[PDB]
């Protein structure tokens, strides 16, 4: 996260850190707890990965340097990557992770609410993006979970900054014309959440953008509302 600040406990209780351990352990991506055994993230977080035994999923963690050998973590039971996701194209950048055991809910470990199918994002005026990603281009993973407030931009305005990618109805964009606030490397798969009438909901999944926090280059997010049939079908069929 570029231009963000340090979060406090319980602000973002759905945020998880998706890490791998081979010989060393590292944070790779963010995710959102959406059910007691389900995390929602980006499909591209699985590109160039070994099988799922490598993954350690941390929830109820604010600060990655607070993690020790004895910190509990979740392991993966199933990975469901959207059937029509193709890496060079980038559309349908969405994936479900089923955990090996359900998590008990606490004030620091709770699921984010999901939107309805058919939702126009025009009612969301207070949106935030969180993660442990770089704080600048060519930067480094941050220890304390970062938060930043970013306005949504219309798909029409977003499309002007991105020839030659098509910005589809299944994407949502967010950024400042002047730049300086954005998601960055290591924030993939994390939440774009908006607060409406006292409650937070997941509007987007952190996906792509040009560099980080550049002028006139908004971040692009998978629009969760446009995949709610898929999310419901896949989690029900699995469960």
């Amino acid at each position: 996260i570029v231009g963000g600040t340090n979060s406090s406990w319980g602000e973002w209780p759905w945020q998880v850190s998706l890490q791998v351990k081979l010989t060393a352990q590292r944070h790779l991506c963010g995710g959102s707890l959406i059910g007691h055994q389900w995390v929602l993230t980006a499909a591209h977080c699985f590109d160039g990965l070994p099988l799922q035994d490598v993954w350690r999923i941390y929830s109820g963690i604010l600060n990655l340097s607070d993690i020790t050998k004895d910190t509990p973590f979740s392991q993966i039971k199933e990975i469901i990557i959207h059937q029509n996701y193709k890496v060079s194209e980038g559309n349908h950048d969405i994936a479900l992770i089923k955990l090996q055991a359900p998590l008990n809910y606490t004030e620091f470990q709770k699921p984010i609410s999901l939107p309805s199918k058919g939702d126009t994002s025009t009612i969301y005026t207070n949106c935030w993006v969180t993660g442990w990603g770089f704080s600048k281009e060519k930067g480094e993973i941050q220890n304390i979970l970062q938060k930043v407030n970013i306005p949504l931009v219309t798909n029409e305005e977003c499309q002007k900054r991105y020839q030659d990618y098509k910005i589809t109805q299944r994407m949502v964009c967010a950024g400042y014309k002047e730049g300086g606030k954005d998601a960055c490397k290591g924030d993939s798969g994390g939440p774009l959440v908006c607060k409406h009438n006292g409650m937070w909901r997941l509007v987007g999944i952190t996906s792509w953008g040009e560099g980080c926090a550049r002028r006139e280059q908004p971040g692009v997010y998978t629009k969760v509302a446009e995949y709610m049939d898929w999310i419901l079908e896949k989690t029900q069929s699995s469960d």
């Binding site: 790779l28 991506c29 980006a42 591209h44 977080c45 590109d47 160039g48 890496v87 060079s88 980038g90 950048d93 990603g133 990618y165 998601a183 960055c184 490397k185 290591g186 924030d187 993939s188 952190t206 996906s207 792509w208 953008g209 040009e210």
Partner: peptide, 10 residues
């Protein structure tokens, strides 16, 4: 993954 994406080796 293409460079516009945010994983560490994109």
């Amino acid at each position: 993954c293409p460079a516009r994406f945010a994983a560490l080796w994109c």
